[PDB]
UniProtKB/Swiss-Prot annotation:
The insulin-like growth factors, isolated from plasma, are structurally and functionally related to insulin but have a much higher growth-promoting activity. May be a physiological regulator of [1-14C]-2-deoxy-D-glucose (2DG) transport and glycogen synthesis in osteoblasts. Stimulates glucose transport in bone-derived osteoblastic (PyMS) cells and is effective at much lower concentrations than insulin, not only regarding glycogen and DNA synthesis but also with regard to enhancing glucose uptake. May play a role in synapse maturation. The gene is IGF1. It comes from the Eukaryota. This is Insulin-like growth factor 1. Residues 2-30 are annotated as: B. Residues 31-42 are annotated as: C. It comes from Homo sapiens (Human). Disulfide bonds join C7-C49, C19-C62, C48-C53. Changing R51W: Found in a patient with primordial dwarfism; uncertain significance. Coiled coil: none annotated. The lineage of its organism: Eukaryota, Metazoa, Chordata, Craniata, Vertebrata.
Length: 71
């Protein structure tokens, strides 16, 4: 029962809804540079759980999306 925030099972559920049946994945703990380490890039759960992550940004963790019109 946080201050109108998403964290825990509820947070995961929101991710599934936003991402859809497509699913989602988690970014690696390390990549390039040390700036990412300083920032809360450890996990999407911690970012939303602690800080207030926007729905639009949250969609980034969702799986790739394709256009309505086939290419």
């Amino acid at each position: 029962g946080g201050p109108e925030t998403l964290c825990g099972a509820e947070l995961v559920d929101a991710l599934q809804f936003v991402c859809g049946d497509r699913g989602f994945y988690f970014n690696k703990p390390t990549g390039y540079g040390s700036s990412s380490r300083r920032a809360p890039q450890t996990g999407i759960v911690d970012e939303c759980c602690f800080r207030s992550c926007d729905l639009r940004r949250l969609d980034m963790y969702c799986a790739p999306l394709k256009p309505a019109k086939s290419a």
